[PDB]
Amino acid sequence: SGFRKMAFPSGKVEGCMVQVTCGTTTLNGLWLDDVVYCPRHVICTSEDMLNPNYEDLLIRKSNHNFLVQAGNVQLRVIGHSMQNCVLKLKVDTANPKTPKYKFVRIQPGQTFSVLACYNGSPSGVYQCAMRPNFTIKGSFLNGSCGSVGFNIDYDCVSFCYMHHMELPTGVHAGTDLEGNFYGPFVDRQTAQAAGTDTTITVNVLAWLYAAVINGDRWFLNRFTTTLNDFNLVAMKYNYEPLTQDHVDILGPLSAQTGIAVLDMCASLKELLQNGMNGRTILGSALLEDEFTPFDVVRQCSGVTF
Amino acid sequence: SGFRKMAFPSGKVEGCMVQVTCGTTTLNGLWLDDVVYCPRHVICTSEDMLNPNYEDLLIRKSNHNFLVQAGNVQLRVIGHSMQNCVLKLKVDTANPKTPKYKFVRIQPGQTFSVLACYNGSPSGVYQCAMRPNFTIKGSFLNGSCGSVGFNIDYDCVSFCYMHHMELPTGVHAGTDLEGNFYGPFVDRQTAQAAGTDTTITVNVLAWLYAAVINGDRWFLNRFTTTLNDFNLVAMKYNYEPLTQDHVDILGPLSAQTGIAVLDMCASLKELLQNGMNGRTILGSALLEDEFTPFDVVRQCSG
């Protein structure tokens, strides 16, 4: 029993984190096989980050201008190369701790674990959602750039996120491990803002299902509804449309508790209009949207890695 | 920027998680050098749950009654003993992945990371606090017993909790790694009294200091308060007494924000009285007590 913001065990990723230094800029890289992945902006001085030409800045730079530290051991670079917004440094040694892994791109609403690192040393781990506006509400200070986000599926680490930069609202922006940014952002010290963020309806519903499975039942009513009727309520309260796809995904939790989804939507509908009337759900006054259906099921079934 | 409940990197603890089996019972164990530590209730049968006699159940066991599994490898048990409520199994292989470590007994209000495990396989990692009533609000299903809580300070892992049981209210009781329970709990399935939970006052104050450091001052006011008058108001909201020691401990965060501790107590007082009128602090619609003064310093600089 119990329900918490649960991160994946970080041991497989801790073994891949290294320090990447270029001039005075230090930040984190991911060392898999003989390649070190990190943000390309490690080749930028404070002057050059205002309006950088990366291909031009990179063409100057040679292998010996990149210091890579894996703990207290030096890795010699023997190849640099750019893919979209990530720098690929080839090194003389394959990482003996390379896990089974893949690069994947997550959708808004999907969650992942972030391993925060400073000077290539992991400091902490936490669970995140890719927001609809493609930002993450992380906790990064200076030197956290190159920190990665990941899911584990059996023995396989799926890397989905590399931290690049902070926005002025205190939220964060980054790429997939193939250097493609999540959201309409660019790697440049500049006036960039997050769009109007929305609430991930399917996640809130999944977390209400987690409440019911943990004995919190006070928000259930006798009333059902329709997707069309519920979505008009969602739109009004800055909630994502709920799709037939989302209803299918909530199928296992709808079966395991005997609450329809349109039933649970009716509950959310009423929670959206009338508020929580001073009560809480899973020790929260606001509706949590950073737990997927899969996250709920995995934690109320106890799958291991 | 940002403020998230941050667990420690679980890697050094993942390397120590093993499976212990005795009869039909299987739970997790902690493999450090040549010793495996687990809840002694692994040796209880289903009719031993109410009034187990551990000395009498243990003397009827030999080494080969304990199956220890470290991944697919079987560890060889060459000795066993009991210390308070943990079973200590001597094995013939020292854990090669043994980090630098110490065992420490924490006080209520202190925070740690839990590695939740099943069959000696880590499932997830989350941060939590020792409540004043010596329970923790964890996430723990059947078979999670022997999961450990810890802090990492440099290279050194401080083990402070091993999970033993769930109480009828859905909160979790466990022992230190010397096998002494936190709170008035015993490894019996008798009716056990989960004492009245209070809010960890010194933690809420730290989290308010953290909100100021991330540039949020909307909850401050122009009042100060005496320690005693603050505590008379706080008890009425089920808040733990704030002591002089708690006040000394907040000194650094006071100095960083230029807000005296008793000025910040004045804020909380007013916060308790008003609620938040549709506002949030560090993303929360209630007052967060699961971050310590030390946790806030580690995660904040502004």
Ligand SMILES: C=CC(=O)N(CCC)[C@H](C(=O)NCc1ccc2c(c1)OCO2)c1cccc(O)c1
């Ligand atoms: C009374 C039932 C109960 O305690 N439950 C079931 C849920 C209430 C599990 C539990 O706490 N076992 C710990 C334990 C094992 C053997 C013992 C013992 C205590 O005392 C002596 O012999 C339980 C259930 C779910 C999760 C969990 O962590 C523990």
